[PDB]
Amino acid sequence: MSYNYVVTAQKPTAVNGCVTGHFTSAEDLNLLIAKNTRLEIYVVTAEGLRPVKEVGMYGKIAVMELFRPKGESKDLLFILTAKYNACILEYKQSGESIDIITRAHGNVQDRIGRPSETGIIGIIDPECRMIGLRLYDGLFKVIPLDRDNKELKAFNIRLEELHVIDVKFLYGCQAPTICFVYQDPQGRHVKTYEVSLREKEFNKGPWKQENVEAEASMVIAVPEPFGGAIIIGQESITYHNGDKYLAIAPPIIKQSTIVCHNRVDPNGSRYLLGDMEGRLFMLLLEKEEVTLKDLRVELLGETSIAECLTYLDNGVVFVGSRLGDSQLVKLNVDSNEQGSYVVAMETFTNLGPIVDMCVVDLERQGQGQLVTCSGAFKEGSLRIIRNGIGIHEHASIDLPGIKGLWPLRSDPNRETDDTLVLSFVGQTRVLMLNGEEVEETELMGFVDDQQTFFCGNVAHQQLIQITSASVRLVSQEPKALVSEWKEPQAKNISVASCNSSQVVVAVGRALYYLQIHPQELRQISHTEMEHEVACLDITPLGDSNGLSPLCAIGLWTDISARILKLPSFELLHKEMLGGEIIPRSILMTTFESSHYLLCALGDGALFYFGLNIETGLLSDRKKVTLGTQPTVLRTFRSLSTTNVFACSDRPTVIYSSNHKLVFSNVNLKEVNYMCPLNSDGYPDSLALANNSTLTIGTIDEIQKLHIRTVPLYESPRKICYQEVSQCFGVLSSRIEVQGTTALRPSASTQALSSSVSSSKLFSEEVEVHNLLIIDQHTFEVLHAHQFLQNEYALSLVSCKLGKDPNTYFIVGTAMVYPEEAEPKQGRIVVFQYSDGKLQTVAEKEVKGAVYSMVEFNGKLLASINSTVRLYEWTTEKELRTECNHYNNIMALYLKTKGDFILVGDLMRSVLLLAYKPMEGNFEEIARDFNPNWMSAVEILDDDNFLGAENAFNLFVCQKDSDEERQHLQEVGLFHLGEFVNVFCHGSLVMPTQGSVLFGTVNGMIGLVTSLSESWYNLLLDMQNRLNKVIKSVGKIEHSFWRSFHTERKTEPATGFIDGDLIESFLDISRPKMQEVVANATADDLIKVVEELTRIH
Amino acid sequence: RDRPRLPDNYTQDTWRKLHEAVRAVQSSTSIRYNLEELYQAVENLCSHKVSPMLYKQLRQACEDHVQAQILPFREDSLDSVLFLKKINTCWQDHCRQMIMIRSIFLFLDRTYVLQNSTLPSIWDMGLELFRTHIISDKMVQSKTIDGILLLIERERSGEAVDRSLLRSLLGMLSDLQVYKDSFELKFLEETNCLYAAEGQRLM
């Protein structure tokens, strides 16, 4: 059995459905957005959208519609899940508490039935007498509402028409009357039926069947004043109310098909119509006194490609896109001087259809960083996703070579530090930082002639400044120095340390203790150590008296972060570290629990300790490596607690979450030094210096995934990283119409240089394909190589073959002609990117589409239509076949680990192939004989093969343990609810084995990893407990939701743990946890689930 | 606001401090800084574009110290009792001063040498200097191999010689590739002939 842990790294972002209504209150105007499994509830404020609740359904929300039964105060929500879980949800807010109570639920899946082509339709009678569901061909399910169910007992009416395109309930009808477009051999017709809940069968509709446009795909029920319906086809919009037949053919809607609509008014005098190009139309009904006079279509402008669009109010339209970012636009009354009335107010990030992705350790850190081919035709783009703290760069001033930063309250009254001090080489330069303005004005009592190791605010309403020569305690209000101490031998201080009350400064191999007294500096303690001081910290933490009790020291030649008792300078502990590198910073702080010490060596290693207030003995030695540069540690106090910052090549915030020390990355290039600042113009901000300038900003500290966007303006298809060349190769595709003309300037057409394929091998709207070389720093298109006419680039690998050292971009293409269903022609083109140009190094005419190429032990492993063949790179630099394999319907997906090749098929689902090098041919090792239609495949272990079937399922196959040994065993089954397009080894972070990311059509990024048997058993137990405790929105069972589901098979999940459900173990109160943990203690499991969340 | 500073003295006192600190730590000459002031000096008066010529500065200074180490080791004595002790002690001296200059020039590492892989490390430059001028390219090489073949062979007949000396010498060998390039062979071939004589004798 396999033990796999699936979790969501990025929740789905694609909006598959949105409705508006009064759901949270009778007066609120809500925008309910269905992202595949997430239901997002907003309140339509006068500006933007205010999130109120986001719930997770145990289902893909297939239907989502608001309806108000008679007597109900506010809208109830009907949701139908892809697995046909129906529910009626009501929103009940009890003060702070928010609930989504299930007013009814059920499962309306017919045991058998041909799921309708056009897909699950769910309509609700405008008077809420019934919910009509078209799930299967030839049937129409009715869920009565007047018979107030709690179980949603539904009945079928046999529909004499088997190919129904769209269907709506008409308005202003005494009976529930449906109007639907259906396709019969004689064309497309629009028909109406009256639904009798008493007779449970149809009746003759108000107005008989009518022969409509050939491509009629939309029915719009028009509210009561007009009644009737508006059927949208490709070339016409026609209106039917039974005797009235208005019909228009606006030439502007011929270019693209209309796919979504929304009623702007309550009376249906205006509709929005979104097309697959992203245009937005306004369909106007001119009334005459009321009947309908005429129809008009006007082009408002362009938006993202809308799947669903909803008109909120005051011209604000939410454009919910599956292919691009969802939008919140405004409709201006007047045009924009570009003919467009649409003006984007807001954009919601959508990792669109993730068709491919790669994990690159860009910026040469220890952190993975996804780069994904997201989006589609006009909305295509590269998204770069990473985990790290983000801050705004508000106040910049470019002073080279900073070596100091300290917050000073120059206004003695305020507890805000309205002054900033900086030491550079041998002097101190101050900043007023007054307001948001920054200029250098001088505060008395501090010297412009000496370096400053420290300065800051101290007690007795005093400031302190420790210089390379001697210390200076200034009285803030009255005047300059009245207390100065200096070394008796006047030796420059080599290492310093200070807090609000006392001072501790090292002079070579001896140390001096001073303490502050008002207008005085008193020296008390002294010691003579073995070797020179390296670093100190004396910070009072949990002080509660006025003076720290303890100190820490690092020494040279005896490398050891030792501990000292403050009043005596005596050795409390001496702990060695190793290595020849002096520690450069040492700090102690509290993280929620007690004093810790943080000592680091010059190469980013960093040891955290549990420090006692009585013994101060160092134990619990454990190490973490952070960066390569020597380091420095300065704290900032957040809202919550102390949050320590590390400054080096890789600036990292340091903190503890749920009593577990976290090491977050910050997404800035470099930080020399840091200091907190909370000015009047700057609250709780940071002050981060680099070699050039002083950057200033603030950190959210929510550890959210940051997503960059590189608009390509054309559909990206594949992406691979060529490290040696510092670039990404991206297969892009743009649609040209006419010879041909680009409908818009795409990223391919806007490259620095360009080229077109001149090949000797092969001699409306079309797809042009390009190979984009994209800079891995600036993400600019360094080059765009267009491929042959009618050539589709499908696969793309970056690798070096054979024995030559050049790293090649290898593209496998196909020749696509409309005269055929499967390409007969294609070629494997080898490119080399060097000197900003993309030379064609080789070619190879193959006899099919090259769906996939993986570099396989120095050799190129391509999969032409049904054959998997292995190519070798000869000394002449051409591809020469070595072996073939033919027992495939369509080798769509190829993976590799050692000598083994995993082949995902179009419908035979996986095949474990081995290249036996001793012979030079393939061997079919194992095969999964179940008919799973793959969407992607991966190799987890030597013998575990992750798969994704096009029915939104994950399965793990396993080479078993005779001719039954050639049977892969499906030991893992799990319904993801997402369509996986890609797997890839890697992790977005610095118990579990391995880490496989996957990207889906909806925009989910998930993470599969291997568990051990013990942890898997424990987590399965807790999964069952949480199912017994946590209650889902539509009262759907988690086991039913995660059960493997196909139209010809259904099995319960196994070998897979829903990491979402487990990680939900933190968001429940302690009594509920105890309900979970009846039969070890809870805190153990909190530790477990925290450690589990550590992986993403 | 904030008239600029002058960096002029910063640059020119620097080089002299570099070579005296080199001159300090090499030969174990005493320091008036306790080395931490020097570390801070490395940290401050080294910046962008300073470090590479700074590397030149320090590596020529330490290089000439290494080549000053040469002369007592170009010799005609044939002790392996004592000459190899001298080599070992020079090895230890070299070790402590290269670790200690790293205790000063760790800023250089965590700025350009640990944070850019373009140079031999202080480790690596030191080892190449020591090897090239004391260990490799000399009669010492052949003499030390012969002597350690003596020591082990003497220790292959009974007596113990000095476990520490053999351990330290083999350490020098393997780290300087002098136990993995071609001086494993003298070891193994002497083992072959000697142990053949042993086996067919007491057989």
Contact list in A for residue B100 (CB cut-off 8 A) is: 556-557, 580
Locate A672 and state its tokens. 């020399």
Task: Identify the bridge partners of residue B103 per DSSP, sorted by sequence position.
Answer: none
**Which distant-in-sequence residues (6+ apart) come within 8 Å of A505 by Cβ?**
A466, A471, A493, A495, A496, A497, A498, A511, A512, A514
Residue A494 burial (CB count, 10 A): 24
Locate A195 and state its tokens. 């639904």
B108 in helix, strand or coil?
Answer: helix
Is some CB atom of chain B closer than 8 A to the CB atom of A672?
Answer: no
Is some CB atom of chain A closer than 8 A to the CB atom of B109?
Answer: yes
Decide if A182 contacts A136 (C-beta within 8 A).
no
* CA atoms of A457 and A383, how far apart (whole Å): 45
Q: Taking the alpha carbons of A935, A61, A283, A348 in that order, is the dihedral positive or negative? A: negative
Q: How many angstroms is the resolution?
A: 3.0
Is some CB atom of chain A closer than 8 A to the CB atom of B5?
Answer: yes
Burial class of residue A619 in the structure, from the number of CB atoms within 10 Å of its CB (0-12 exposed, 13-18 middle, 19+ buried): exposed
Contact at CB, A509 and B34, closer than 8 angstroms: yes
Shortest Cα distance, chain A CAs vs residue B163, angstroms: 24
Is some CB atom of chain A closer than 8 A to the CB atom of B34?
Answer: yes
HSE of A611, CA atoms in CB hemisphere, 13 A: 28
Q: What is the largest CA-CA distance in chain B?
A: 95
Residue A1007 burial (CB count, 10 A): 22
Torsion, Cα B71 B74 B77 B82, to 10 degrees, reads 60
Fold identical between A4-355 and A392-707? yes
Please state at what angle helix A1082-1093 crosses helix A1013-1029, rounded to 10 degrees.
110
Cα distances from A672 to residues A29, A347, A505, A575, in angstroms, run: 50, 35, 22, 28
Question: Strand A867-873 vs strand A766-775: parallel, antiparallel, or unpaired?
Answer: unpaired
Cα distances from A833 to residues A361, A551, A779, in angstroms, run: 20, 57, 16
Query: Solving technique for this entry?
Result: cryo-EM
Give the chain B residue nearest A629 (alpha carbons). Answer: B110
DSSP state of A153: -
Contact at CB, A581 and B39, closer than 8 angstroms: no
**Which distant-in-sequence residues (6+ apart) come within 8 Å of A568 by Cβ?**
A525
* CA atoms of A416 and A395, how far apart (whole Å): 17
Locate A729 and state its tokens. 């190769």
Of A425, A430, A508, which is closest to B45 when you measure between CB atoms?
A425
B60 in helix, strand or coil?
Answer: helix
**Which distant-in-sequence residues (6+ apart) come within 8 Å of B131 by Cβ?**
B176, B178
Q: Taking the alpha carbons of B21, B22, B23, B27 in that order, is the dihedral positive or negative? A: positive
Q: Indicate which of B110, B111, B112 best probes the interface with A, i.e. most A CBs within 10 Å of its own CB.
A: B110
* CA atoms of A561 and A1085, how far apart (whole Å): 34
Torsion, Cα A212 A218 A221 A222, to 10 degrees, reads -80
B133 in helix, strand or coil?
Answer: helix
Contact list in B for residue A648 (CB cut-off 8 A) is: 110
Please state at what angle helix B83-104 crosses helix B122-130, rounded to 10 degrees.
160
* CA atoms of A438 and A431, how far apart (whole Å): 7
Shortest Cα distance, chain A CAs vs residue B6, angstroms: 9
> Which stretches within A264-410 are classed as H helix?
none
Backbone angles phi, psi at B125, to 5 degrees: -60, -45
Task: Identify the bridge partners of residue A797 per DSSP, sorted by sequence position.
Answer: A810
Breaks (C-N over 2.5 A) in chain B follow: none
Backbone angles phi, psi at A855, to 5 degrees: -75, 125
Decide if A905 contacts A889 (C-beta within 8 A).
yes
Decide if A128 contacts A145 (C-beta within 8 A).
yes
- The number of helices, as runs of H, and strands, as runs of E, in chain B is 9, 0
- The number of helices, as runs of H, and strands, as runs of E, in chain A is 5, 87
Backbone angles phi, psi at B26, to 5 degrees: -75, 140
Is some CB atom of chain B closer than 8 A to the CB atom of A441?
Answer: yes
A1004 in helix, strand or coil?
Answer: coil
Shortest Cα distance, chain A CAs vs residue B42, angstroms: 11
Decide if A452 contacts A465 (C-beta within 8 A).
yes
Least Cα distance to A1059 among A9, A83, A354 occurs for A9
Question: Strand A4-10 vs strand A1056-1058: parallel, antiparallel, or unpaired?
Answer: parallel
Residue A781 burial (CB count, 10 A): 26
Going through A595-723 in order, the beta strands assigned E by DSSP cover 595-600, 605-608, 622-625, 633-637, 642-646, 652-657, 660-665, 674-677, 685-689, 694-697, 705-711, 715-722
Backbone angles phi, psi at B149, to 5 degrees: -65, -40
Decide if A377 contacts A711 (C-beta within 8 A).
no
* CA atoms of A427 and B2, how far apart (whole Å): 12
Least Cα distance to B72 among B57, B59, B82 occurs for B82
Contact list in B for residue A691 (CB cut-off 8 A) is: 47-48
* CA atoms of A334 and A340, how far apart (whole Å): 8
Unique residue bearing structure tokens 């098979």? A1049
Contact at CB, A531 and B106, closer than 8 angstroms: no
Cα distances from A688 to residues A366, A421, A633, A693, A697, in angstroms, run: 22, 13, 12, 9, 8
Least Cα distance to A78 among A133, A11, A160, A6 occurs for A133
Is some CB atom of chain B closer than 8 A to the CB atom of A425?
Answer: yes
Q: What share of chain A is helix, strand, coil (3-state, %, to 5)?
A: 5, 50, 45
Is some CB atom of chain A closer than 8 A to the CB atom of B47?
Answer: yes
Give the chain A residue nearest B123 (alpha carbons). Answer: A580
Task: Identify the bridge partners of residue A1005 per DSSP, sorted by sequence position.
Answer: A10, A999
Backbone angles phi, psi at A670, to 5 degrees: -155, 150
Task: Identify the bridge partners of residue A521 per DSSP, sorted by sequence position.
Answer: A516
Contact list in B for residue A432 (CB cut-off 8 A) is: 1
Fold of A392-707: Methylamine Dehydrogenase; Chain H (2.130.10)
HSE of A953, CA atoms in CB hemisphere, 13 A: 29
Is some CB atom of chain B closer than 8 A to the CB atom of A663?
Answer: no
Contact at CB, B114 and A629, closer than 8 angstroms: yes
**Which distant-in-sequence residues (6+ apart) come within 8 Å of B115 by Cβ?**
A628, A629, A649, B109
Give the chain B residue nearest A451 (alpha carbons). Answer: B44
Contact list in B for residue A531 (CB cut-off 8 A) is: 34
**3-state SS string over A936-964?**
EEEECCCCEEEEEECCCEEEEEEECCCHH
* C-alpha A294: how far from chain center: 47
Q: Concatenated DSSP letters for A9-74? A: EE----EEEEEEE--S-SS--EEEEEETTEEEEEEE-SSSEEEEEEEE-SS-EEEEEEE--TT-SS
DSSP state of A582: P
* CA atoms of A688 and A677, how far apart (whole Å): 10
How many Å is the Cα radius of gyration of chain B?
22
Q: Indicate which of A533, A580, A603 best probes the interface with B, i.e. most B CBs within 10 Å of its own CB.
A: A580
Give the chain A residue nearest B40 (alpha carbons). Answer: A494
Decide if A892 contacts A934 (C-beta within 8 A).
yes
Locate B114 and state its tokens. 């640990």
Please state at what angle helix B51-68 crosses helix B83-104, rounded to 10 degrees.
160
Of A426, A439, A629, which is closest to B10 when you measure between CB atoms?
A426
Burial class of residue A1 in the structure, from the number of CB atoms within 10 Å of its CB (0-12 exposed, 13-18 middle, 19+ buried): exposed
Give the chain A residue nearest B44 (alpha carbons). Answer: A425
Q: What share of chain B is helix, strand, coil (3-state, %, to 5)?
A: 70, 0, 30
Q: Taking the alpha carbons of A707, A713, A719, A725 in that order, is the dihedral positive or negative? A: negative
Least Cα distance to A385 among A620, A658, A667, A576 occurs for A667
Contact list in A for residue B39 (CB cut-off 8 A) is: 582
* CA atoms of A716 and A645, how far apart (whole Å): 39
**3-state SS string over A769-824?**
EEEEEEECCCCCEEEEEECCCCEEEEEEEEECCCCCCCCEEEEEEEECCCCCCCCC
| Helix or strand (DSSP H, E) at A344 | strand A342-348
Give the chain B residue nearest A534 (alpha carbons). Answer: B36
Decide if A596 contacts A608 (C-beta within 8 A).
yes
Is some CB atom of chain B closer than 8 A to the CB atom of A1036?
Answer: no
Decide if A877 contacts A871 (C-beta within 8 A).
no
Unique residue bearing structure tokens 């040696």? A724
Decide if A888 contacts A907 (C-beta within 8 A).
no
Residue A647 burial (CB count, 10 A): 25
**What's at A454, amino acid-wise?**
F
Least Cα distance to A433 among A670, A688, A678 occurs for A678
Locate B187 and state its tokens. 């070891």
Backbone angles phi, psi at A113, to 5 degrees: 155, 145
How many Å is the Cα radius of gyration of chain A?
34
Least Cα distance to A972 among A994, A1002, A940, A995 occurs for A940
Is some CB atom of chain A closer than 8 A to the CB atom of B106?
Answer: yes
Q: Taking the alpha carbons of A1071, A1072, A1076, A1082 in that order, is the dihedral positive or negative? A: negative
DSSP state of A593: S
Interface of A with B in 476-535 (CB under 8 A): 492, 494-495, 506-509, 531-534
* CA atoms of A712 and A747, how far apart (whole Å): 5
Contact at CB, A426 and B33, closer than 8 angstroms: no
Decide if A33 contacts A16 (C-beta within 8 A).
no
Is some CB atom of chain A closer than 8 A to the CB atom of B11?
Answer: no
Burial class of residue A163 in the structure, from the number of CB atoms within 10 Å of its CB (0-12 exposed, 13-18 middle, 19+ buried): middle
Is some CB atom of chain B closer than 8 A to the CB atom of A658?
Answer: no
Shortest Cα distance, chain A CAs vs residue B110, angstroms: 4
Unique residue bearing structure tokens 């993403």? A1096
Shortest Cα distance, chain B CAs vs residue A674, angstroms: 17
* CA atoms of A335 and B84, how far apart (whole Å): 92
Give the chain B residue nearest A532 (alpha carbons). Answer: B34
| Helix or strand (DSSP H, E) at A1060 | helix A1059-1063
Q: Taking the alpha carbons of A614, A618, A622, A625 in that order, is the dihedral positive or negative? A: positive
Is some CB atom of chain A closer than 8 A to the CB atom of B118?
Answer: no
| Helix or strand (DSSP H, E) at A1062 | helix A1059-1063
Locate A253 and state its tokens. 């809607």
Cα distances from B16 to residues A420, B21, B41, B58, B185, in angstroms, run: 34, 8, 12, 11, 47
Q: How many residues does chain B have?
A: 203
**Which distant-in-sequence residues (6+ apart) come within 8 Å of A437 by Cβ?**
none
Going through A160-315 in order, the beta strands assigned E by DSSP cover 164-169, 177-184, 187-196, 201-204, 210-211, 218-221, 229-232, 237-240, 245-248, 258-263, 270-275, 279-288, 291-302, 308-313
Question: Strand A781-786 vs strand A753-756: parallel, antiparallel, or unpaired?
Answer: parallel
Of B7, B9, B34, which is closest to A532 when you measure between CB atoms?
B34
Is some CB atom of chain B closer than 8 A to the CB atom of A701?
Answer: no
Contact at CB, B99 and A580, closer than 8 angstroms: yes
Give the chain B residue nearest A556 (alpha carbons). Answer: B103
Locate A981 and state its tokens. 């397009």
Cα distances from A657 to residues A1066, A1088, B190, in angstroms, run: 12, 13, 63
Q: Concatenated DSSP letters for A374-408? A: E--TTT-EEEEEEE-B-B-----B--SS----EEE
Contact list in B for residue A424 (CB cut-off 8 A) is: 5
Q: Concatenated DSSP letters for A69-83? A: -TT-SS-EEEEEETT
Unique residue bearing structure tokens 């096009």? A950
Cα distances from A138 to residues A152, A393, A647, A673, in angstroms, run: 21, 61, 67, 71
CATH architecture of the region A4-355: 7 Propeller (2.130)
Contact list in A for residue B45 (CB cut-off 8 A) is: 425
Contact at CB, B5 and A495, closer than 8 angstroms: no
**Which distant-in-sequence residues (6+ apart) come within 8 Å of A681 by Cβ?**
A433, A435, A436
Contact at CB, B47 and A691, closer than 8 angstroms: yes
Torsion, Cα A399 A401 A403 A405, to 10 degrees, reads 20
Q: Taking the alpha carbons of A440, A444, A448, A452 in that order, is the dihedral positive or negative? A: negative
Give the chain A residue nearest B107 (alpha carbons). Answer: A630
Locate B51 and state its tokens. 């470090």
